[PDB]
Amino acid sequence: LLAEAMVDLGAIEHNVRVLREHAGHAQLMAVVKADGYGHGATRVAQTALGAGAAELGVATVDEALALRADGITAPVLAWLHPPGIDFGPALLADVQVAVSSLRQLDELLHAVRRTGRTATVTVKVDTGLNRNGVGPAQFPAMLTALRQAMAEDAVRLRGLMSHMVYADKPDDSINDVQAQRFTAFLAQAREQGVRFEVAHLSNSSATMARPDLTFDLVRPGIAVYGLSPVPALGDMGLVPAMTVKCAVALVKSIRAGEGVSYGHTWIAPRDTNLALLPIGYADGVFRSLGGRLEVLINGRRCPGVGRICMDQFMVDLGPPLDVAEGDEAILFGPGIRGEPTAQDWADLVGTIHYEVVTSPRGRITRTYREA
Amino acid sequence: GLLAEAMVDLGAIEHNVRVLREHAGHAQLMAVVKADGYGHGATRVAQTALGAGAAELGVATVDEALALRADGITAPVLAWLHPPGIDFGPALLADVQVAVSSLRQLDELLHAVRRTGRTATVTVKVDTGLNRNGVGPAQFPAMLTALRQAMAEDAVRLRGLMSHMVYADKPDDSINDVQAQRFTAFLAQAREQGVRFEVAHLSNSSATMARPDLTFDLVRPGIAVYGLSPVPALGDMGLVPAMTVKCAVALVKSIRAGEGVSYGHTWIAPRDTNLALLPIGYADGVFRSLGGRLEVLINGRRCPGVGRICMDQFMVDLGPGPLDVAEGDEAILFGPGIRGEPTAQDWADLVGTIHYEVVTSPRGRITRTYREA
Numbered sequence: 001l002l003a004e005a006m007v008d009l010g011a012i013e014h015n016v017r018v019l020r021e022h023a024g025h026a027q028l029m030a031v032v033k034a035d036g037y038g039h040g041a042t043r044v045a046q047t048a049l050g051a052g053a054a055e056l057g058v059a060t061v062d063e064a065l066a067l068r069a070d071g072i073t074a075p076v077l078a079w080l081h082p083p084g085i086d087f088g089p090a091l092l093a094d095v096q097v098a099v100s101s102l103r104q105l106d107e108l109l110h111a112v113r114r115t116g117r118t119a120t121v122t123v124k125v126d127t128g129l130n131r132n133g134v135g136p137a138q139f140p141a142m143l144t145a146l147r148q149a150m151a152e153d154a155v156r157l158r159g160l161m162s163h164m165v166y167a168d169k170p171d172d173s174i175n176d177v178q179a180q181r182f183t184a185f186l187a188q189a190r191e192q193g194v195r196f197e198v199a200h201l202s203n204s205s206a207t208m209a210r211p212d213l214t215f216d217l218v219r220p221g222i223a224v225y226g227l228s229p230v231p232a233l234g235d236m237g238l239v240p241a242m243t244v245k246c247a248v249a250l251v252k253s254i255r256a257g258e259g260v261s262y263g264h265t266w267i268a269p270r271d272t273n274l275a276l277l278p279i280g281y282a283d284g285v286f287r288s289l290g291g292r293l294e295v296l297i298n299g300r301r302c303p304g305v306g307r308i309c310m311d312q313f314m315v316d317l318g319p320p321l322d323v324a325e326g327d328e329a330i331l332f333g334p335g336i337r338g339e340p341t342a343q344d345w346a347d348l349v350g351t352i353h354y355e356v357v358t359s360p361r362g363r364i365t366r367t368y369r370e371a
Numbered sequence: 372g373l374l375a376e377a378m379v380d381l382g383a384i385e386h387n388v389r390v391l392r393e394h395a396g397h398a399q400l401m402a403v404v405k406a407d408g409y410g411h412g413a414t415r416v417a418q419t420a421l422g423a424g425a426a427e428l429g430v431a432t433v434d435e436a437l438a439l440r441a442d443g444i445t446a447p448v449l450a451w452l453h454p455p456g457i458d459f460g461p462a463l464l465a466d467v468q469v470a471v472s473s474l475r476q477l478d479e480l481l482h483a484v485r486r487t488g489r490t491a492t493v494t495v496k497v498d499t500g501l502n503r504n505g506v507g508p509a510q511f512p513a514m515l516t517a518l519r520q521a522m523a524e525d526a527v528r529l530r531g532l533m534s535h536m537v538y539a540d541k542p543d544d545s546i547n548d549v550q551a552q553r554f555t556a557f558l559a560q561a562r563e564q565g566v567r568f569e570v571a572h573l574s575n576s577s578a579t580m581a582r583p584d585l586t587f588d589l590v591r592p593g594i595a596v597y598g599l600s601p602v603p604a605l606g607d608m609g610l611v612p613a614m615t616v617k618c619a620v621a622l623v624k625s626i627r628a629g630e631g632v633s634y635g636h637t638w639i640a641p642r643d644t645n646l647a648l649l650p651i652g653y654a655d656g657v658f659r660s661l662g663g664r665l666e667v668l669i670n671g672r673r674c675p676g677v678g679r680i681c682m683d684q685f686m687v688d689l690g691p692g693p694l695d696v697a698e699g700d701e702a703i704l705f706g707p708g709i710r711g712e713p714t715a716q717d718w719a720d721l722v723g724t725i726h727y728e729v730v731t732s733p734r735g736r737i738t739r740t741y742r743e744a
């Protein structure tokens with residue numbers, strides 16, 4: 001292969017087992033939206049379920065239907081629905097739907113009547129993010145509609161959910177505030193004669209660092225992929241599952257004073273040897289990494305030199321060569337062999353590793369190492 | 372009923388190709404459609420460019436060429452980036468032109484000619500200063516002697532000499548003239564050794580539009596085909612950006628002064644206002660670093676992003692004025708600018724990159740669609 005994003009399903013399994021230890025008695029919903037954060041939703045889901053995850057979480061019904069089409073029968077919850085969605089296919093495919101407004105509930109109920117299939121409903125409430133959750137003042141009307149719908153077997157009241165303002169800051173008191181607001185939502189439900197089967201608030205950071213805030217289920221995403229939910233703490237016992245690598249396509253001699261790549265932004269201070277790596281920013285190698293990233297080749301760090309192009313970049317091998325055409329360059333991975341990590345890229349680019357792992361594409365073929 | 376789309380206006384593609392052809396003068400035009408047409412769709416852009424006067428197509432890899440051929444493209448296609456040890460046989464059998472950048476690569480190609488019995492239509496990619504891949508002056512004489520023997524037995528047709536410019540976006544710089552002179556030197560070496568190339572090409576979009584004095588037999592523009600200016604400091608250069616990225620407004624909501632929005636509450640409302648949720652994010656190619664910087668166009672008005680861009684969504688501020696946005700309305704993230712929307716260059720400026728990277732970013736939920744010419 002020209003380049004690959006190898007997903008170690010053994011690491012996925014390890015991470016899920018670590019998360020289950022932190023979750024204690026709470027069931028685990030593995031979040032595999034965005035094609036498993038770039039790792040492959042279906043393969044990650046299968047591995048996570050086999051390692052004891054109880055359920056799957058995705059953003060869209062489309063993502064849930066793709067899992068269903070691949071043979072996944074485990075519970076799948078979808079929580080982001082565009083205007084105009086037809087909930088009918090979700091119902092016929094036994095996809096759970098989280099509603100975040102009375103309009104969405106009414107839409108879902110019309111679909112229940114049309115398909116004849118009871119909806120397994122979760123309600124998504126806002127406890128601070130201020131995105132699409134139902135707000136406190138609108139919750140009672142939703143409870144009343146839900147209770148009436150439940151009283152005619154139109155819905156099963158499965159879940160109450162909300163999402164944390166901090167993905168990476170377990171010590172901030174907004175975590176505590178959100179949990180208290182969540183408890184207050186549950187008290188509202190009680191006052192309106194409504195009981196949810198399960199309630200869940202926790203992302204990876206809360207699961208691993210705020211077990212005192214865990215409700216009935218946890219909903220980890222980033223930690224399933226082995227990426228630290230609190231980077232300042234280190235790897236938190238997780239193993240990043242994605243390794244991005246590519247073959248050395250060319251080894252070329254350069255004389256001192258020669259410029260390299262567009263604009264000649266790098267000029268060789270010495271006679272040296274370069275490696276051409278045939279992936280670039282159209283493949284997810286952020287152009288801002290130019291002149292800052294390093295790769296690992298035959299156990300040695302080799303720094304990028306010159307601009308990242310659309311489909312290639314150069315690294316400096318130094319001055320007799322220990323690298324041949326066809327040898328493997330590791331761009332990032334768990335770090336086991338000394339390679340950079342997704343967090344290293346995030347630091348260089350000014351982003352977070354979530355964005356790093358949803359970047360590889362194009363010539364970077366996704367592959368799998370079995371557990 | 373798409374949640375989001377990258378709408379490619381093929382009438383813009385046609386316009387841009389006709390503009391490039393005018394600038395090309397006496398030269399023919401090879402449309403560069405690598406990286407899936409710079410994210411615009413290699414096959415659809417290729418078909419349009421060919422109908423608007425493009426003579427040939429250029430891609431990086433044989434794989435890209437084979438995808439065009441599989442889609443029914445029969446026009447000339449040149450591929451110029453090959454991994455070591457490639458089997459060139461499939462390229463030969465699919466009538467893919469091959470640019471070689473080393474003597475070793477020529478040997479691989481001739482080995483494939485021997486195995487398949489199919490003549491290779493060869494271009495030599497020479498190094499005139501980029502120092503990436505390309506045959507250097509030291510190796511070119513040996514290359515010519517080898518090509519002459521291969522041509523004599525009809526193992527190769529010697530189609531092309533090519534090189535690539537160090538500056539994609541600065542036509543005035545003297546290195547452009549230096550590279551053109553080095554390129555002429557390669558051509559003169561070939562002529563003196565009795566090796567005739569049918570065509571020579573050096574010009575990218577920048578050179579094609581701004582340095583007609585440096586044009587050889589073909590020009591090889593990419594970025595300007597997609598309407599993106601090859602010299603941003605000169606403006607749109609008469610081109611029309613062909614990609615419009617847009618999405619449906621998923622939610623409109625009011626918020627109160629003092630409330631934070633999105634992860635980390637990095638934006639706190641200074642006043643009561645209305646927000647819209649746009650259901651695409653950085654996994655769809657909306658660079659996270661756009662957060663708190665970008666604006667979108669909704670019903671003719673600029674609406675700034677507020678709070679962090681999430682994996683699959685972000686919020687924009689509609690303001691506290693009379694609400695003129697409904698769920699299901701169209702929000703334009705970038706486009707040619709005709710309606711006052713931001714451009715890809717605007718994104719490039721905000722995040723510190725180039726529009727080349729902007730247009731190869733949209734993906735995921737952003738479905739590629741086409742408006743016919």
Ligand SMILES: Cc1ncc(COP(=O)(O)O)c(/C=[NH+]/[C@@H]2CONC2=O)c1O
Nearest residue numbers: 309310403535539575576591592593594
């Ligand atoms: C051999 C060759 N010839 C013409 C073009 C077309 O170049 P542009 O007209 O400037 O788009 C390209 C494309 N180069 C891409 C652009 O971004 N970075 C790159 O490496 C090319 O590799």
Ligand SMILES: Cc1ncc(COP(=O)(O)O)c(C[NH2+]c2conc2O)c1O
Nearest residue numbers: 031163167203204219220221222681682
């Ligand atoms: C409803 C819901 N529940 C759990 C998780 C899992 O969160 P995490 O453990 O931090 O990966 C997410 C993921 N949210 C994001 C990741 O990147 N941008 C985002 O908006 C989520 O939307």
Ligand SMILES: [Ca+2]
Nearest residue numbers: 697698699700
């Ligand atoms: Ca409307």
Ligand SMILES: [Cl-]
Nearest residue numbers: 079080131132
């Ligand atoms: Cl959501």
Ligand SMILES: [Cl-]
Nearest residue numbers: 126129131133
């Ligand atoms: Cl929310």
Ligand SMILES: [Cl-]
Nearest residue numbers: 473474475510
């Ligand atoms: Cl050579």
